[PDB]
């Protein structure tokens, strides 16, 4: 319900970041994903407990290195949204790279 | 100098002290091993595609009695050439010819064949075949799949470090790993009990997985506890004593032995008291009562009166049970043993926790536990138990996993079926209890013996199995009801979904990657790359921060150096030089055998499990010629940590000092004297470099450059070479040697030199010839020189004269000051070839062809174009010039009542409103290279592409005519030789052509033989020539695949020459990058007493922080190398005799320490000395190895020969002030590099452009532009300054207003310079969005 | 662009590339060619920019002569990450920086980038030359230790 809005906002901001930073590889294209992981995440606990209540995100982790180790729950719940957003936006970034080479008539 | 017929021109002075037994490998065994295992067919059913064929076939699945077996997987031919299919933009794949057979059996006929069909070839599968380098092509682009590492099937262990309980208690688990299917794990409880985890679900009870083996609980507990016989016969209460079963026991009561006391209360239980009880034959004696109360009845007992429900499973005995067993009269009572005292009784506790002891209740419980909720239906539980039971299709324990399961349990067999059995889970539980005791240590997670490295063949097989089970699903669908409806040539399997699946897999996201075009050492380290990211390592059951760290198994298997500079640092480990994948899949590095007296020169390949018990000596240790160890205490190691051993306690030895580094960082001399992070940084400098035009050799190398340049495949390697016939700038042909020769295929081989075509990272590839004319070569010798290659030796960058001083500020911390002479030599002038990919849109209405004659174009731009909108080859495009004519089709506008004059002038919108031309976005300059218009079958593009067709026809004729002309010349020689015995008319042969009127009437037997042989051979050669010519003619002019939205795809290669620039992204081999401050002229730079100005000045102040002593020694050694080369150049310019330069070359190549290089002269004399003098006149190629390389004394004794001061402090002057410098500068020579980044490519700050509705995001000034990232912290910095108007521009006017940009542009251009402050058109949008609801916004002060 | 070092141009001055500064002040070039009467129409000024003759460089030298600018790295953890300077034309495509501003920027000269913000209004020029100069801030705004330290 609210995770779809965050997903669409992250897709739009990541498309604008790859449009602006105009890089054309799959090895160095990660700083635009760092732009999407640091901007599209919600700030305080209201939307964080509101987005994770909606579908699209789970508690289990894909990579062990990105999991934080602290006693504050809000840092782990923010890094959860960040890691899930990077995992769900890697393939969409490569799809918009495949659409990106012949999108704008220039 | 007789090794590969190219070292004789350029002798490398090797400083390798330690002896080498094993030579340098092919460096592509990892990429080619799985390919030669997957494609080559094995009649034995293991390790291949035939092994995957025999594991799922034959199947019928519904009452058919008709099996399908097809033993044919050998025939396969590529459809075109590799380079031609790479140019044409088509994927490079080959069909798989599989011949099938079918057997139809009658009803109730065992082993009866009534009908059969024969199929010679069934078209299925289009597999791409890799080349000898390992670059298979999709859509005209080479793709390299990165090899991975995955958790091999076996038995794993982990301690869990007290994670889920957080007190500090360990939790041992034995997670069995299959090849595919469900995973099973065991769990320890904080209350010391066992649980089962299946597919990461909740906790299962313990003994339900083991009592489902058609077993009873009493048999399980009798398998647990052993050999305790407590007997009661007429109130006896006397049992058997066990002295040897226990080492100590707290005796709380008096223990007597045959009328006398043996162990008193609180008596000694020492070795003497045990010996006095064991030496005397003591029968069964009385025990105290309280030993019984701590015991548990074991087996299923029944009384005389009562039956069941007593002593069933873990019944704690009380005072109500002793009277019952005394009334029933039990002769033998089985009680506990307290087995495994180091761990304790744990099975009886799990029996006490688990209420269920029946098998059917266990199946109902596990059937309700797998699903979230299902009612018990008496057949679902058996099906769910069979699904977890080991089978063939749903479960796999193939040869690697079965061998690991045998080695984990100390079994002696290696061959078995891929299924578990009844005793296997019992042995796994026994192994878990054995780890719980302590006999046997817990294996670490990050061993290389636990993780198996998989390559591209296993990945292709694992993806092909999904297509194969789809194929057998289609076969099971087709064989249903199709008894007489087989249709073996008609109703076969559609090969389109499996081709789409293999095209998606070889064009995947994580696995298949693009090969980086810069510095082909980067290519050969992409081909030797092992990463952990992907769908296979996506699960990560046991991972964390420890996986990214280094384990001491990483000694010689992979390298700890080569990791990328991104976030994933520590998880990509490049494979080392000498390591080799075993036949199971694990990595093995070679070790030579050491006997008692001598050292045997043979080598073995050792794995991690072998070296866990073996002893491995160090690499740097003394060894004489015979093999006797002269050192009494050789420093060695046992399990990874170095500790001093004796001379005979080791039986292995390292072959060479190269195994601890891979091929990427083996080009850096003195890796001891550089820091590890800085060596990693130097590897990240060497991973990217554009090729240079001059390509000067590394004067300081390691000897790895020739091996990389001969093993990467970027240069042409001459096979069966010999006398060279003809070499030009595009072709190399070699006359065949008389040593090896094919009967009928003696001929010549053609080497087509690839010219300047576009690569992946916009780089040029070129192949310069090495042998000019008339020189014998060897099979293995090089002939072409690729990008960054100097005469078959790898030359990534170029070296220059370096002055170590602080300058006037132009080198701050690590900046670089260069000279103007480097610009004068056109040095590292990069050549960037980009792609012009034209598009011709096809709509619902209008024509499809894009033609010439586009209006609204000036005649100055139309003069450089030929017909049909293509420019001439050699015309320069600068910015907005037209390379191809873009054409919108004539649809969408012919049914318009308006704009008739616009359709008369500039009809159907042939150009845009206001846009640039479609060549390159603006800011460039450069000429065209090659046009690649490829046509469709029936498209009529002759007027645009007739030139390339005629040119490629002439190239094909010039390539494939010379071999048959040499064969025809040999035919004419045999004509001139066959008529010697009869009718000598050689003057008539030389006078009249055409075989002297075609072999006139000589002696009849020889005449008939000559006419028959010449007619037969001439007609067959003419027919074969016409067949090859017509076949290649049908190959060239044809059609290829294309998207239906476009008609043609025009590819124009556009070369751009980029001059010198102050950014330059310049670096070295030791992790020292820097930028150009200012282009410094020649006359104002320091120079020595001979007047040679320096070429580059870097900053020594970074030296004590970047820890680069190897840079200093490379500098001081390159100084001596170029000094020897300059003395050779002076002897050449003085034109001395051969014998005077000969003694100098001998003294330069023998004087030193024991570097064991037995190269010498008097092999070739009076020739080829001037050639090597002209080769090495620009500098001496001294090869310095990494670990057994140069010392300081070797550098001093070699540098005294070049008439240079020993400390390196060469006194310099000044070019700006002329004052003699104090603190004499150690000048020398360093091998510099230019990276991929360019300062003119990083250009930004677009201007006010049209077609922008919000935030100036579409159509700015760039290639593809977008306006954002002012920042979220810079706004707060402007708040911290107190900037209001700059922040006001950051809010509305400069940032987020359309009318405000026009007003500000009018203010700047008209000269008003009025800001007009306020809240323009953003707060108005806020008011329109707030007042849309039932609440409004008023207006007050 | 890529930041390089400039061993001159006293503290309230830095460098700026030629082909970048020719483009950064394009409406200012248009306005001053309208003011001096050298360009009659706007397309004449757009052609005079494309020709790159000497009087265009004279007008550009009149633009850059006493006009401020902002240099602004992407990590601004504190206020001294963005600093106002004075551009001087440098041959090439890279930016020459004052040597002693590296501790305030917390980065070394290895190819790190810095945005070049042009003050477009007169009040923004006053904000640059009054508050954001490197000569206005000598001490640190958090400790009192001077931020300009030789290295």
From Swiss-Prot, chain A:
Effect of residue 53 to E: Partial loss of inhibition of the host exclusion defense system BREX
Record InterPro entries: B-form_Ocr (IPR036207), Ocr (IPR014798)
Residues spanning the signal sequence: none
Transmembrane segments annotated in the record for this chain: none
Keyword line: Early protein, Host-virus interaction, Inhibition of host innate immune response by virus, Restriction-modification system evasion by virus, Viral immunoevasion
Disulphide bridges: none
Gene Ontology biological-process entries: symbiont-mediated evasion of host restriction-modification system; symbiont-mediated suppression of host innate immune response
Subunit annotation: Homodimer. Interacts with HsdM (AC P08957), the M subunit of host type I methyltransferase restriction enzyme M.EcoKI; 1 Ocr dimer binds to M.EcoKI. Interacts with HsdR (AC P08956), the R subunit of host type I bifunctional endonuclease and methyltransferase restriction enzyme R.EcoKI; 2 Ocr dimers binds to R.EcoKI. Interacts with host PglX/BrxX (AC P0DUF9); this interaction inhibits the enzymatic activity of PglX/BrxX through high-affinity binding. Forms a 2:2 tetrameric complex with phage T7 OCR.
Protein name (database record): Protein Ocr
Organism: Escherichia phage T7 (Bacteriophage T7)
From Swiss-Prot, chain B:
GO cellular component: cytoplasm; cytosol; cytosolic DNA-directed RNA polymerase complex; membrane; transcription elongation factor complex
Outcome of swapping residue 677 to H/K: Resistant to antibiotics salinamide A and B
This protein's UniProt keywords: Acetylation, Antibiotic resistance, DNA-directed RNA polymerase, Nucleotidyltransferase, Transcription, Transferase
Enzyme class name: transferase
CDD domains noted in UniProt: RNA_pol_B_RPB2
UniProt-listed SUPFAM superfamilies: beta and beta-prime subunits of DNA dependent RNA-polymerase (SSF64484)
Applied biotechnology uses: Co-administration of salinamide and rifampicin or salinamide and myxopyronin suppresses the emergence of resistance to both antibiotics.
N6-acetyllysine PTM sites in chain numbering: 1022, 1200
Modification comment: Acetylated on several lysine residues in the presence of glucose.
UniProt GO molecular function: DNA binding; DNA-directed RNA polymerase activity; ribonucleoside binding
Superkingdom of this protein's organism: Bacteria
Keyword Phosphoprotein listed: no
Reactions accelerated catalytically: RNA(n) + a ribonucleoside 5'-triphosphate = RNA(n+1) + diphosphate
Assigned EC number: 2.7.7.6
Alphabetized Pfam families for the sequence: RNA_pol_Rpb2_1, RNA_pol_Rpb2_2, RNA_pol_Rpb2_3, RNA_pol_Rpb2_45, RNA_pol_Rpb2_6, RNA_pol_Rpb2_7
UniProt keyword Acetylation, yes or no: yes
Summary of subunit composition and partner proteins: The RNAP catalytic core consists of 2 alpha, 1 beta, 1 beta' and 1 omega subunit. When a sigma factor is associated with the core the holoenzyme is formed, which can initiate transcription. The rRNA transcription and antitermination complex (rrnTAC) consists of RNAP, NusA, NusB, NusE (rpsJ), NusG, SubB, ribosomal protein S4, DNA and precursor rRNA; S4 is more flexible than other subunits. In pull-down experiments interacts with CedA.
Function (record text): DNA-dependent RNA polymerase (RNAP) catalyzes the transcription of DNA into RNA using the four ribonucleoside triphosphates as substrates. Resistance to the antibiotics salinamide A, salinamide B, rifampicin, streptolydigin, CBR703, myxopyronin, and lipiarmycin can result from mutations in this protein.
Similarity comment: Belongs to the RNA polymerase beta chain family.
Name under which the protein is recorded: DNA-directed RNA polymerase subunit beta
Swiss-Prot record, chain C:
Binding site for Mg(2+): 108, 110, 112
Record's comment on post-translational modification: Acetylated on several lysine residues in the presence of glucose.
Biotechnology: Co-administration of salinamide and rifampicin or salinamide and myxopyronin suppresses the emergence of resistance to both antibiotics.
Highest taxon of the lineage: Bacteria
Recorded family membership: Belongs to the RNA polymerase beta' chain family.
Subunit organization: The RNAP catalytic core consists of 2 alpha, 1 beta, 1 beta' and 1 omega subunit. When a sigma factor is associated with the core the holoenzyme is formed, which can initiate transcription. The rRNA transcription and antitermination complex (rrnTAC) consists of RNAP, NusA, NusB, NusE (rpsJ), NusG, SubB, ribosomal protein S4, DNA and precursor rRNA; S4 is more flexible than other subunits.
Protein task: DNA-dependent RNA polymerase (RNAP) catalyzes the transcription of DNA into RNA using the four ribonucleoside triphosphates as substrates. Resistance to the antibiotics salinamide A, salinamide B, rifampicin, streptolydigin, CBR703, myxopyronin, and lipiarmycin can result from mutations in this protein.
Name by which UniProt lists this protein: DNA-directed RNA polymerase subunit beta'
Full-sequence portion shown in this chain: 353 to 503 of 1407
């Amino acid at each position: 319900m609210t995770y779809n809005n965050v997903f669409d906002h992250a897709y739009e901001m990541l498309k604008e970041n790859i449009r602006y930073d105009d890089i054309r590889d799959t090895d160095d294209l990660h700083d635009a994903i760092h732009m999407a992981a640091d901007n599209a995440v919600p700030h305080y606990y209201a939307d964080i407990f509101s987005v994770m209540a909606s579908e699209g995100i789970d508690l289990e982790f894909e990579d062990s290195g990105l999991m934080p180790d602290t006693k504050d729950v809000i840092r782990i719940l923010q890094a959860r949204i960040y890691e899930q957003l990077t995992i769900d936006l890697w393939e969409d970034a490569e799809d918009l790279l495949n659409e990106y080479l012949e999108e704008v008539e220039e | 100098m007789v090794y590969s017929y190219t070292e004789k021109k350029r002798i490398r002075k090797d400083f390798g002290k330690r002896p080498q037994v094993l030579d340098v490998p092919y460096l592509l065994s990892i990429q080619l091993d799985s390919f030669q295992k997957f494609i080559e067919q094995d009649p034995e059913g293991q390790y291949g595609l035939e092994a995957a064929f025999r594991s799922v076939f034959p199947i019928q699945s519904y009452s058919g009695n008709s099996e399908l077996q097809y033993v044919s997987y050998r025939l396969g031919e590529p459809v075109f050439d590799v380079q031609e299919c790479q140019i044409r933009g088509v994927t490079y794949s080959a069909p798989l010819r599989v011949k099938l057979r079918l057997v139809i059996y009658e009803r109730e006929a065992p082993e009866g064949t009534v009908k059969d069909i024969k199929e010679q070839e069934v078209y299925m599968g289009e597999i791409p075949l890799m080349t000898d380098n390992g670059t298979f092509v999709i859509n005209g682009t080479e793709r390299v799949i990165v090899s991975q590492l995955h958790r091999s099937p076996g038995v794993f262990f982990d301690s869990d470090k007290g994670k889920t309980h957080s007190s500090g208690k360990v939790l041992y688990n034995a997670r069995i790993i299959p090849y595919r299917g469900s995973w099973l794990d065991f769990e320890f409880d904080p209350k010391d009990n066992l649980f089962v985890r299946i597919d990461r679900r909740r906790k299962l009870p313990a003994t339900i997985i083991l009592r489902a083996l058609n077993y009873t609980t009493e048999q399980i507990l009798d398998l647990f506890f052993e050999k305790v016989i407590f007997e009661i016969r007429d109130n006896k209460l006397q049992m058997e004593l066990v002295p040897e079963r226990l080492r100590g026991e707290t005796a709380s009561f008096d223990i007597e032995a045959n009328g006398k006391v043996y162990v008193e209360k609180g008596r000694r239980i020492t070795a003497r008291h045990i010996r006095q009880l064991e030496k005397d034959d003591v029968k069964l004696i009385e025990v105290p009562v309280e030993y019984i109360a701590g015991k548990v009845v074991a087996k299923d007992y029944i009384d005389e009166s009562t039956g069941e429900l007593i002593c069933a499973a873990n019944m704690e005995l009380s005072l109500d049970l002793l009277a019952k067993l005394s009334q029933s009269g039990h002769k033998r009572i089985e009680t506990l043993f307290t087995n495994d005292l180091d761990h304790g009784p744990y099975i009886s506790e799990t029996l006490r926790v688990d209420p269920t002891n029946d098998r059917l209740s266990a199946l109902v419980e596990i059937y309700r536990m797998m699903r979230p909720g299902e009612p018990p239906t008496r057949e679902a539980a058996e099906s769910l138990f069979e699904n977890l039971f080991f089978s063939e299709d749903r479960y796999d324990l193939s040869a690697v996993g079965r061998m690991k399961f045998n080695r984990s349990l100390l079994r002696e067999e290696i061959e078995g079926s891929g299924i578990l059995s009844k005793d296997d889970i019992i042995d796994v539980m026994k192994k878990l209890i054995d780890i719980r005791n302590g006999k046997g240590e817990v294996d670490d997670i990050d061993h290389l013996g636990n993780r198996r490295i998989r390559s591209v063949g296993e990945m292709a097989e694992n993806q092909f199995r999904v297509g194969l089970v789809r194929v057998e699903r289609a076969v099971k669908e087709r064989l249903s009801l199709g008894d007489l409806d087989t249709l073996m040539p008609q109703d076969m399997i559609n090969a389109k979904p499996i081709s789409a699946a293999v095209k998606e897999f070889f064009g995947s996201s994580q696995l298949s990657q693009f090969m980086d075009q810069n510095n082909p050492l980067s290519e050969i380290t992409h081909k030797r790359r092992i990463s952990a990211l992907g769908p296979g390592g996506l699960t990560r059951e046991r991972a964390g921060f420890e996986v990214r760290d280094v384990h001491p198994t990483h000694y010689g298997r992979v390298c700890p150096i080569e990791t990328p500079e991104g976030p994933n640092i520590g998880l990509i480990n490049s494979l080392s030089v000498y390591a080799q994948t075993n036949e199971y899949g694990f990595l093995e590095t070679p070790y030579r055998k050491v006997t008692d007296g001598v050292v045997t020169d043979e080598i073995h390949y050792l794995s991690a499990i072998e070296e866990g018990n073996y002893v491995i000596a160090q690499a740097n240790s003394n060894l004489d010629e015979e093999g006797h160890f002269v050192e009494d205490l050789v420093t060695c190691r046992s399990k990874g940590e170095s500790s001093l051993f004796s001379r005979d306690q080791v039986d292995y030895m390292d072959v060479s000092t190269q195994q601890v580094v891979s091929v990427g960082a083996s080009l850096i001399p003195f890796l001891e004297h550089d820091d590890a992070n800085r060596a990693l940084m130097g590897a990240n400098m060497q991973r990217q470099a554009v090729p240079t035009l001059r390509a000067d050799k590394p004067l300081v190398g390691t000897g790895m450059e020739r091996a990389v340049a001969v093993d990467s495949g970027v240069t042409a390697v001459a096979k069966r070479g010999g006398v060279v016939q003809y070499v030009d700038a595009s072709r190399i042909v070699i006359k065949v040697n008389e040593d090896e020769m094919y009967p009928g295929e003696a001929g010549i081989d053609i080497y087509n030199l690839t010219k300047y075509t576009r690569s992946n990272q916009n780089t040029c590839i070129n192949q310069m010839p090495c042998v000019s004319l008339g020189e014998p070569v060897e099979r293995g010798d090089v002939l072409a020189d690729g990008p960054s290659t100097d005469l078959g030796e790898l030359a990534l960058g170029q070296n220059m004269r370096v002055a170590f001083m602080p300058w006037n500020g132009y080198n701050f911390e690590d900046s670089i000051l260069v000279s103007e002479r480097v610009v004068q030599e056109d040095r590292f002038t990069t050549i960037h070839i980009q792609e012009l990919a034209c598009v011709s849109r096809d709509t619902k209405l209008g024509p499809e062809e894009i033609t010439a004659d586009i209006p609204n174009v000036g005649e100055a731009a139309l003069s450089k174009l030929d017909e049909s909108g293509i420019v001439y080859i050699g015309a320069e495009v600068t910015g907005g010039d037209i390379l191809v004519g873009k054409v919108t089709p004539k649809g969408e506008t012919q049914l318009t009542p308006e704009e008739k004059l616009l359709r008369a002038i500039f009809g159907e919108k042939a150009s845009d409103v206001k846009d640039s031309s479609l060549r390159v976005p603006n800011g460039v300059s450069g000429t065209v290279i090659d046009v690649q218009v490829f046509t469709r079958d029936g498209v009529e593009k002759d007027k645009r592409a007739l030139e390339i067709e005629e040119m490629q026809l002439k190239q094909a004729k010039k390539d494939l005519s010379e071999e048959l002309q040499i064969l025809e010349a040999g035919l004419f020689s045999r004509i001139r030789a066959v008529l010697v015995a009869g009718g000598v008319e050689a003057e008539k042969l030389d006078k009249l052509p055409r075989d002297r009127w075609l072999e006139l009437g000589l002696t009849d037997e020889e005449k008939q033989n000559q006419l028959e042989q010449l007619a037969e051979q001439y007609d067959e050669l003419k027919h074969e020539f016409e067949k090859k010519l017509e076949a290649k003619r049908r190959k060239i002019t044809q059609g290829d695949d294309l998207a239906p939205g476009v008609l043609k795809i025009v590819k124009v290669y556009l070369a751009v020459k980029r001059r010198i620039q102050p950014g330059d992204k310049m670096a070295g081999r030791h992790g020292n990058k820097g930028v150009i401050s200012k282009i410094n002229p020649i006359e104002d730079m320091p120079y020595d007493e001979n007047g040679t100005p320096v070429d580059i000045v870097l900053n020594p102040l970074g030296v004590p922080s970047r820890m680069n002593i190897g840079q200093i020694l490379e500098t001081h050694l390159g100084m001596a190398a170029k000094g020897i080369g300059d003395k050779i150049n002076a002897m050449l310019k003085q034109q001395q005799e051969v014998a005077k330069l000969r003694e100098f070359i001998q003294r330069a190549y023998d004087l030193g320490a024991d570097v064991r290089q037995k190269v010498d002269l008097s092999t070739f004399s009076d020739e080829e000395v001037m050639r090597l003098a002209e080769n090495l006149r620009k500098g001496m190629p001294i090869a310095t190895p990494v670990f057994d390389g140069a010392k300081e004394a070797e550098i001093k004794e070699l540098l005294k020969l070049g008439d240079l001061p020993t400390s390196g402090q060469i006194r310099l002057y000044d070019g700006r002030t002329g004052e003699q410098f104090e603190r004499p500068v150690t000048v020398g020579y360093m091998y510099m590099l230019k990276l991929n980044h360019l300062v003119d490519d990083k250009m930004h700050a677009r201007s006010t452009g049209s077609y922008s509705l919000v935030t100036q995001q579409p159509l700015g000034g760039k290639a593809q532009f977008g306006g954002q990232r002012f920042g979220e912290m810079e706004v707060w910095a402007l708040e911290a300054y107190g900037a209001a108007y700059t922040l006001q521009e950051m809010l509305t006017v400069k940032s987020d207003d359309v009318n405000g940009r026009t007003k500000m542009y009018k203010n700047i251009v008209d000269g008003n310079h009025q800001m007009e402050p306020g809240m323009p058109e953003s707060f108005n949008v806020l008011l329109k969005e707030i007042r849309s609801l039932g609440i409004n916004i008023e207006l007050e002060d | 662009s890529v930041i390089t070092v400039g061993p001159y141009l006293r503290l309230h001055q830095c460098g700026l590339p030629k082909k970048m500064a020719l483009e950064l002040f394009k409406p200012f070039i248009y306005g001053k060619l309208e003011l001096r009467g050298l360009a009659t129409t706007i397309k004449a000024a757009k052609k005079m920019v494309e020709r790159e003759e000497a009087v265009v460089w004279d007008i550009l030298d009149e633009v850059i002569r006493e006009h401020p600018v902002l240099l602004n790295r992407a990590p601004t953890l504190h206020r001294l990450g963005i600093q106002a300077f004075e551009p001087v034309l440098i041959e090439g495509k890279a930016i020459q920086l004052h040597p002693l501003v590296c501790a305030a920027y917390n980065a070394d000269f290895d190819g790190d980038q810095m945005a070049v913000h042009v003050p477009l209004t007169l009040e923004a020029q006053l904000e640059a030359r009054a508050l954001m100069m490197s000569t206005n801030n000598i001490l640190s705004p958090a400790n009192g230790e001077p931020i300009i330290v030789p290295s």
